[PDB]
Structure 1
Amino acid sequence: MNITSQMNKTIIGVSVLSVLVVSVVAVLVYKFYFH
């Protein structure tokens, strides 16, 4: 079980990139289909 001891900064970065990306897509379709 991860005890939130330490984490790589690089990991956080990519994580955010995937967050926005995914979100954007969901929105693009939401409008492109249900504008």
Structure 2
Amino acid sequence: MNITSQMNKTIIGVSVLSVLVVSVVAVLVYKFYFHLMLLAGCIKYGRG
């Protein structure tokens, strides 16, 4: 761990760390996506 050179080890750690971040990233992106709408239409309009 804590490496990023031309070593098989780094290939595993990096590949794994990436898969995690990527997943979590899109996860909240779509998951929270709904929350946004709920927060947006949480209060009626007020053009005045």
**Could you say which TM-score interval applies, normalised by the shorter chain?**
0.5 to 0.7
* Higher helix proportion: 1
Bigger RCO of structures 1 and 2 (CA < 8 A, at least 6 apart): 2
TM-score by length of 1: 0.64
Per the TM alignment, residue 18 of structure 1 is displaced from its structure 2 partner at its CA by 0.4
5+ unaligned residues in a row in structure 2: which ranges? 36-48
Which of structures 1 and 2 has the bigger CA Rg? 2
Query: Aligned residues, how many?
Result: 35
Per the TM alignment, residue 4 of structure 1 is displaced from its structure 2 partner at its CA by 20
5+ unaligned residues in a row in structure 1: which ranges? none
Distance 1:30 1:7, change over 3 A: same
Distance 1:13 1:32, change over 3 A: same
